[PDB]
Design a protein around this ligand. Structure first.
Ligand SMILES: [K+]
Ligand SMILES: [K+]
Ligand SMILES: [K+]
Ligand SMILES: [K+]
Ligand SMILES: [K+]
Ligand SMILES: [K+]
Ligand SMILES: [K+]
Ligand SMILES: [K+]
Ligand SMILES: [K+]
Ligand SMILES: [K+]
Ligand SMILES: [K+]
Ligand SMILES: [K+]
Ligand SMILES: [K+]
Ligand SMILES: [K+]
Ligand SMILES: [K+]
Ligand SMILES: [K+]
Ligand SMILES: [K+]
Ligand SMILES: [K+]
Ligand SMILES: [K+]
Ligand SMILES: [K+]
Ligand SMILES: [K+]
Ligand SMILES: [K+]
Ligand SMILES: [K+]
Ligand SMILES: [K+]
Ligand SMILES: [K+]
Ligand SMILES: [Mg+2]
Ligand SMILES: [Mg+2]
Ligand SMILES: [Mg+2]
Ligand SMILES: [Mg+2]
Ligand SMILES: [Mg+2]
Ligand SMILES: [Mg+2]
Ligand SMILES: [Mg+2]
Ligand SMILES: [Mg+2]
Ligand SMILES: [Mg+2]
Ligand SMILES: [Mg+2]
Ligand SMILES: [Mg+2]
Ligand SMILES: [Mg+2]
Ligand SMILES: [Mg+2]
Ligand SMILES: [Mg+2]
Ligand SMILES: [Mg+2]
Ligand SMILES: [Mg+2]
Ligand SMILES: [Mg+2]
Ligand SMILES: [Mg+2]
Ligand SMILES: [Mg+2]
Ligand SMILES: [Mg+2]
Ligand SMILES: [Mg+2]
Ligand SMILES: [Mg+2]
Ligand SMILES: [Mg+2]
Ligand SMILES: [Mg+2]
Ligand SMILES: [Mg+2]
Ligand SMILES: [Mg+2]
Ligand SMILES: [Mg+2]
Ligand SMILES: [Mg+2]
Ligand SMILES: [Mg+2]
Ligand SMILES: [Mg+2]
Ligand SMILES: [Mg+2]
Ligand SMILES: [Mg+2]
Ligand SMILES: [Mg+2]
Ligand SMILES: [Mg+2]
Ligand SMILES: [Mg+2]
Ligand SMILES: [Mg+2]
Ligand SMILES: [Mg+2]
Ligand SMILES: [Mg+2]
Ligand SMILES: [Mg+2]
Ligand SMILES: [Mg+2]
Ligand SMILES: [Mg+2]
Ligand SMILES: [Mg+2]
Ligand SMILES: [Mg+2]
Ligand SMILES: [Mg+2]
Ligand SMILES: [Mg+2]
Ligand SMILES: [Mg+2]
Ligand SMILES: [Mg+2]
Ligand SMILES: [Mg+2]
Ligand SMILES: [Mg+2]
Ligand SMILES: [Mg+2]
Ligand SMILES: [Mg+2]
Ligand SMILES: [Mg+2]
Ligand SMILES: [Mg+2]
Ligand SMILES: [Mg+2]
Ligand SMILES: [Mg+2]
Ligand SMILES: [Mg+2]
Ligand SMILES: [Mg+2]
Ligand SMILES: [Mg+2]
Ligand SMILES: [Mg+2]
Ligand SMILES: [Mg+2]
Ligand SMILES: [Mg+2]
Ligand SMILES: [Mg+2]
Ligand SMILES: [Mg+2]
Ligand SMILES: [Mg+2]
Ligand SMILES: [Mg+2]
Ligand SMILES: [Mg+2]
Ligand SMILES: [Mg+2]
Ligand SMILES: [Mg+2]
Ligand SMILES: [Mg+2]
Ligand SMILES: [Mg+2]
Ligand SMILES: [Mg+2]
Ligand SMILES: [Mg+2]
Ligand SMILES: [Mg+2]
Ligand SMILES: [Mg+2]
Ligand SMILES: [Mg+2]
Ligand SMILES: [Mg+2]
Ligand SMILES: [Mg+2]
Ligand SMILES: [Mg+2]
Ligand SMILES: [Mg+2]
Ligand SMILES: [Mg+2]
Ligand SMILES: [Mg+2]
Ligand SMILES: [Mg+2]
Ligand SMILES: [Mg+2]
Ligand SMILES: [Mg+2]
Ligand SMILES: [Mg+2]
Ligand SMILES: [Mg+2]
Ligand SMILES: [Mg+2]
Lengths: 48, 75, 64
RNA sequence: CCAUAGGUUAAUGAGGCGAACCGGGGGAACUGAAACAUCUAAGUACCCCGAGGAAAAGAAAUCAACCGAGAUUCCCCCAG
RNA sequence: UUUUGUAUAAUGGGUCAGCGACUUAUAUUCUGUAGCAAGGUUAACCGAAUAGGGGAGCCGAAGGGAAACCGAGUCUUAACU
RNA sequence: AGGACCGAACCGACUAAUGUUGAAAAAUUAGCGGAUGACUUGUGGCUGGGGGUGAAAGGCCAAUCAAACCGGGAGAUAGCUGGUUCUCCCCGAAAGCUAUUUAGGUAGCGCCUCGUGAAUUCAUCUCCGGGGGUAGAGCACUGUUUCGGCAAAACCCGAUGCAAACUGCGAAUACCGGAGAAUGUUAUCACGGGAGACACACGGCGGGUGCUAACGUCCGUC
RNA sequence: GUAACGGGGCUAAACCAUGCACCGAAGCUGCGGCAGCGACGCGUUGUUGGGUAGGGGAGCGUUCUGUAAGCCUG
RNA sequence: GUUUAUUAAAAACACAGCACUGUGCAAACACGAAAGUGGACGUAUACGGUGUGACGCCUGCCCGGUGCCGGAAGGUUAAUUGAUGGGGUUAGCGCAAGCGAAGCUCUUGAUCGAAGCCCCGGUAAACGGCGGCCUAAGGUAGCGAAAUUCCUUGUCGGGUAAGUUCCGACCUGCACGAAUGGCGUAAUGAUGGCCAGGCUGUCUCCACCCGAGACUCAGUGAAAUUGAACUCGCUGUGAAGAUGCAGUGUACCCGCGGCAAGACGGAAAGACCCCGUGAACCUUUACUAUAGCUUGACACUGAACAUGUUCUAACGUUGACCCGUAAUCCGGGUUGCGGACAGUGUCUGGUGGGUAGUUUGACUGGGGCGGUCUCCUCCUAAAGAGUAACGGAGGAGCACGAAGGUUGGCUAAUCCGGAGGUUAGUGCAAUGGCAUAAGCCAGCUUGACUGCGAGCGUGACGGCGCGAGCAGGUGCGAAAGCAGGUCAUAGUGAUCCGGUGGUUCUGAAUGGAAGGGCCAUC
RNA sequence: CCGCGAUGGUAGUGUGGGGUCUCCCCAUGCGAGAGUAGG
């Protein structure tokens, strides 16, 4: 990231946003995953 | 006591006669109306002439003052 | 050992679907009264990192 | 004044050495930051004390998240 | 060797023999190649086992948004031509 | 009597020559100063490194002193200098721009290379459409200039020149776009792997600077 | 130290004009050979091959491990 | 006397003498985290520090600056203390919106508060200063072309045939001057300058001689250096001063004694000079710290009223005596003195080159000094864009709720109603524009709107610019239409950190909150 | 729609070549401005 002493790109641009703790404990399930569970009922525990 | 100058402004003609342009395209950047806006050409706040329609650039000398107008001939 | 992320870069860039990076525009922190609304409006949405700069950003964010 | 300090003798133990590892008492700077002081190097090097075949830690005033786990230690993940 | 440029009166070497400088570890990306393929691969460890077990994990199959969230869309905006 | 006098031992070190791979990492020779004193010398002791000691020269502290020596941190760091080892084949730069406590460093871009993909993509010429304000020219303008006339020597008129920052004119070339053929190993553009380079030199042409001085200096272009 | 034709020398062996000859390079051509790239007949044709930094491609040789209780060697 | 052992012996250091200043003894001061020790088994006729430097005659004026000393009314001011207000949470109260006790909690910071500083004085043998109307005061005595005088070899006198030196004067002191002493001064000096007698191979100008080398023979036997050498002159050429290139001249092969013009000879990775975001040590009113010194609060730390002192019991004792004991340590005891002081710990303000770590820009016809550094206009700039120099010329770091928007109306300079036609005007440089006026006036106004934005320009990038049109809502005008600031091009500052307002976001068990995000803004 | 102008010569200049090289010349291509006849 050193540019010869010019204020580098990752410092001349502003920070933004925050990180969500909820996003880390949220998943997406594809339709192709629904058959992969045992016994035809899809909930968190059967997906796990 | 000298040694100063300003940045060059890249003025002048961007699209010459007969060039096909899209609407919005800048035709000339200038200081004041060295060229004037003809048919299908707008004049911006800094005297930039730009195409208001798709077509070909046309320079022409018209009026009693014999002024250089720029128009777009629609395709 | 594992490469360390440049943590300042991770706070300023996010990787997009085709592997580019989005960033927030400069010039919208302060000294805002003198700036035209048009100029500020155009600085609000996030922008993509340019081709010249991608190499620098990628080096800083090896786990992007 | 009683006494206590002190004195003499006896018994028992210690003392010193040793490469690393271990716990503790102290603790740099070069260096990096393209200068430099916060910061880094690093609780590293080094000095000191003490131990053992290992040491230290250890049996929840611990986590968790409304479900539960169940002392300490070490390894792989979690994750740059 | 260094230089715009060296027979240079710039540098280095008296000669010979021997030694003398892009490595190693881990991470990461790209190329080649091999395996398997919407999957791929296991770590520690167990195992007398280069086997076999171990799928904890990791990467991929979905993105958009600061985020809640929505989702082949999503964000922007009261709302998009 | 005396930090008294002359002068050996003893202690010094003012001058000169020699010596300078020495007889000697400080001496020899001839002269020189002190020589009862703040003298000199033997033996032993004490002061330790940002510390000592110093009638003070940054002097001396083991041939070492503006911070001893030895070991360690330690392979400190070194944008600097040097050096970098067998062979053949293909391609082949740059010494520029921008930014930089930057200027002999470095970063992005330009230029090299390798890979992948893609258009009649690119170049030359011809024809067509364009904008120019340079060369030249000119003097209405903005300044400058001379002569004559006229006349409040103004102004005005005729005649004559001059201009990077003058233009009532204005090329060649160059550049942008369009069309067409021929030619060219895609010569083009994009994306990705790997760079190097960012001290340039002279010569021609157009110029600034300098003295139309410099093998001078600074641009443009070949 | 001649020292302001490279020298000898030159009255052309100087200069101007016109012309035809010749010499002259690693240029071009001829003959033989090697290699890169472009189409494939796995045919031969077109063309290319000066190179520093540097990129790409392909190799030689050295020590050591397997192949090797093999093979060579008094 | 002393000194740079090893290029400086001196005018340097020291010195007796002088002065200032500190110091009452457990002295100041120094070494030491401390105990202690030196000072000193001394006691102000003593001891430390500082400057000056025998002696003689002397030592002037300035206290404004910096220091030191004294003051202590007033201003300012630390820790500490926590008045007051504001917020979070929730028992309740409310049908809901919300409100909201106690407690806990986040924040605010009244009052208290020492030294210091400001302030008022003093002080120059403190650091220092000592004029051409001005100052704190304007240099006295003495001395002066000087260890000081640039101009300068000043000028005059002396000495010499001739004297930039010397001696004596003059004063025009570039830039003397009174204890960082002034002026003198007998004696002293391996001290600096000048002159004379004697003396001479110092010299005119060298000659001869005696010895040690050098030379030859025998024995022993180094060294630095060295790409390779078949290692000439000259004139040219050329990384610009040639044995090696060109042309030409000269030259049989090889030693020995000699000489040093060249081999840019040998020696030492130039010490000068510049450069490196190198080093060291030194300085200071550079920055940041910090030992030390100093201030107060709380602790060790107590008792009687005063809003004064007294007391003893903590504590001190480097007073005396006794014992452990053969002991100037130490401890215990007795006693005197001092006494809640002193002193030490934690906290805290001041002071703090005593000590430490560091910083102290770049460009540049070498560096420094000066100038410059961002932005705008013109020219250089070669008729697209761009284009350098410590090239040539000027500007900006704003202004304006009208000087913006729109509709209607209007047209200048200058000269003498007319002529003239922008030669004026533009909010401000310059260039290109502007009559359909962009110049100028009036009425009505807030489009100097919010969300967006086809497309394009310009940048390595960060960015910057131009923009029809779409949605919402608006102004002007009759309407067409125009309006997303201003004739255009300068009037500017990334990111971080934080502040303020808003907010269908987040909220570390849960509800909240804090903090964070997002939007606006500083 | 927006109030002059030939012909000829001259100046300049792209490309190639040359000289006595601060400036020119030759071959070839392009060819003004001003002015003249005239309108
Ligand atoms: K355009
Ligand atoms: K440090
Ligand atoms: K550095
Ligand atoms: K050089
Ligand atoms: K040299
Ligand atoms: K790799
Ligand atoms: K692979
Ligand atoms: K969309
Ligand atoms: K030291
Ligand atoms: K670069
Ligand atoms: K590339
Ligand atoms: K050139
Ligand atoms: K002496
Ligand atoms: K004072
Ligand atoms: K409350
Ligand atoms: K003087
Ligand atoms: K003094
Ligand atoms: K005196
Ligand atoms: K020769
Ligand atoms: K010689
Ligand atoms: K007592
Ligand atoms: K007390
Ligand atoms: K220069
Ligand atoms: K120079
Ligand atoms: K609208
Ligand atoms: Mg420029
Ligand atoms: Mg300009
Ligand atoms: Mg903001
Ligand atoms: Mg550093
Ligand atoms: Mg044991
Ligand atoms: Mg244990
Ligand atoms: Mg439970
Ligand atoms: Mg050179
Ligand atoms: Mg050569
Ligand atoms: Mg030589
Ligand atoms: Mg050489
Ligand atoms: Mg060198
Ligand atoms: Mg050498
Ligand atoms: Mg997703
Ligand atoms: Mg004597
Ligand atoms: Mg001595
Ligand atoms: Mg002697
Ligand atoms: Mg004597
Ligand atoms: Mg004597
Ligand atoms: Mg000195
Ligand atoms: Mg020594
Ligand atoms: Mg040191
Ligand atoms: Mg280290
Ligand atoms: Mg090293
Ligand atoms: Mg080639
Ligand atoms: Mg810039
Ligand atoms: Mg001209
Ligand atoms: Mg001109
Ligand atoms: Mg074309
Ligand atoms: Mg550079
Ligand atoms: Mg350069
Ligand atoms: Mg240069
Ligand atoms: Mg150049
Ligand atoms: Mg030239
Ligand atoms: Mg040159
Ligand atoms: Mg020249
Ligand atoms: Mg001669
Ligand atoms: Mg031939
Ligand atoms: Mg050939
Ligand atoms: Mg052939
Ligand atoms: Mg060839
Ligand atoms: Mg080749
Ligand atoms: Mg083998
Ligand atoms: Mg003496
Ligand atoms: Mg000496
Ligand atoms: Mg001496
Ligand atoms: Mg004492
Ligand atoms: Mg003195
Ligand atoms: Mg006070
Ligand atoms: Mg006084
Ligand atoms: Mg007087
Ligand atoms: Mg003089
Ligand atoms: Mg004189
Ligand atoms: Mg005289
Ligand atoms: Mg004489
Ligand atoms: Mg003399
Ligand atoms: Mg005199
Ligand atoms: Mg003096
Ligand atoms: Mg003085
Ligand atoms: Mg005085
Ligand atoms: Mg004085
Ligand atoms: Mg004196
Ligand atoms: Mg005197
Ligand atoms: Mg011999
Ligand atoms: Mg020569
Ligand atoms: Mg000889
Ligand atoms: Mg000799
Ligand atoms: Mg030499
Ligand atoms: Mg050197
Ligand atoms: Mg106290
Ligand atoms: Mg200090
Ligand atoms: Mg210091
Ligand atoms: Mg440091
Ligand atoms: Mg430094
Ligand atoms: Mg510099
Ligand atoms: Mg241009
Ligand atoms: Mg041009
Ligand atoms: Mg250029
Ligand atoms: Mg340039
Ligand atoms: Mg410039
Ligand atoms: Mg778009
Ligand atoms: Mg901060
Ligand atoms: Mg919570
Ligand atoms: Mg919680
Ligand atoms: Mg908030
Ligand atoms: Mg003609
Ligand atoms: Mg004409």
């Amino acid at each position: 990231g050193f540019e010869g002493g010019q204020m580098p790109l990752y410092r001349r641009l502003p920070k933004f946003g925050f990180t969500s703790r909820k996003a880390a404990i949220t998943a997406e399930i594809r339709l192709s995953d629904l058959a992969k569970v045992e016994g035809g009922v899809v909930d968190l525990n059967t997906l796990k | 006591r000298n040694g100063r100058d300003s940045e060059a402004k890249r003025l002048g003609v961007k699209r010459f006669g007969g060039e096909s342009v899209l609407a919005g395209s800048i035709i000339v950047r200038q200081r004041g109306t060295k060229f004037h806006a003809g048919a299908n050409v707008g004049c911006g706040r800094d005297h930039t002439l730009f195409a208001k329609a798709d077509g070909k650039v046309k320079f022409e000398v018209k009026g009693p003052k014999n002024r250089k107008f720029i128009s777009i001939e629609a395709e | 050992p594992k490469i360390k992320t440049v943590r300042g870069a991770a706070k300023r860039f996010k990787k997009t679907g085709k592997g580019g990076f989005k960033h927030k525009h400069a010039n919208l922190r302060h000294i805002l009264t003198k700036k035209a609304t048009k100029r500020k409006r155009h600085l609000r949405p996030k922008a993509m990192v340019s081709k010249g700069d991608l190499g620098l950003v990628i080096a800083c964010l090896p786990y992007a």
